[PDB]
Amino acid sequence: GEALTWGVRSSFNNYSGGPTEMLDGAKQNGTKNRFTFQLESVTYDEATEKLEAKFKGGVHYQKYCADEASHSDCQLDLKIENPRIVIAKGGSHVFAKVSSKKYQSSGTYTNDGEDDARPIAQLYTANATFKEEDGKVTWSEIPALLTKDGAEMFSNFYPVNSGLDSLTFSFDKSQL
Ligand code: HEM
Numbered sequence: 001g002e003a004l005t006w007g008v009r010s011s012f013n014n015y016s017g018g019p020t021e022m023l024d025g026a027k028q029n030g031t032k033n034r035f036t037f038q039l040e041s042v043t044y045d046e047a048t049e050k051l052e053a054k055f056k057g058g059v060h061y062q063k064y065c066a067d068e069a070s071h072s073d074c075q076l077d078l079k080i081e082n083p084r085i086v087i088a089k090g091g092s093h094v095f096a097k098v099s100s101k102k103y104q105s106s107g108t109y110t111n112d113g114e115d116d117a118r119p120i121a122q123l124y125t126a127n128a129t130f131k132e133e134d135g136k137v138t139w140s141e142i143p144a145l146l147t148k149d150g151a152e153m154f155s156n157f158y159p160v161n162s163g164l165d166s167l168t169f170s171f172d173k174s175q176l
Helices: 010-016 148-153
Strands: 003-006 021-023 035-045 050-056 058-067 072-088 092-101 108-112 121-123 129-133 136-146 163-172
Touching: 003 050, 003 072, 010 058, 035 072, 035 163, 050 163, 092 148, 108 148
Parallel strands: none
Antiparallel strands: 003 035, 003 163, 021 058, 035 050, 050 072, 058 072, 072 092, 092 108, 092 121, 121 136, 129 136, 136 163
16 A cells, blocks of 8 residues: 555566666565555646656666676666656656666666656556545556657667556555
8 A cells, every 4th residue: 555566567577587676665576577666645636637646766677787796887777766657637657767778879868757748658547447445545457558758768679659567556545
């Protein structure tokens, strides 16, 4: 409860062997493919029908390290932190603070996670499960697709609109 559960992308966790480290209190399951980010805050504006939930914690993936024992000088170095979900009438998305080294380049893809023009995923709540009981709200198995920014974070290894892991989050009605 009071958390976001999301694995980002199943095949990416398999390719990378999962995050080299969990950041800022985020947790991971035993198989390193499902992450849990604690709820920082949640607001719902009735008139605009906009729900916004901010979570804490991050994942750091590293691969192709020149010093493999200490994970230093890694050609693949991806951080995804403080996920924020916006579920609204005009569109639903996942935003996050990202830093990702680009494939065959010195360029680093960055995203501060506070720019509404640069979401990393688009969310489709039409067929997701929604439950509210005993003051607890859970919105489960919400499908997610990669946006243009999300594709850039993965060095365009995936096309735009390719699938991501579905997400689940929960909060108490008292926190609204
Ligand atoms: C610079 C050296 C790199 C080499 C030699 C390399 C090699 C490969 C190979 C052989 C695959 C195919 C296996 C698979 O799809 O699981 C792959 C997949 C992938 N690579 Fe890397 N890669 C490099 C860097 C990067 C970087 C910098 C990124 C950026 C995030 C990246 C992201 C990906 C992604 C997203 C996939 C798809 C994995 C999946 O979902 O299965 N790669 N890479």
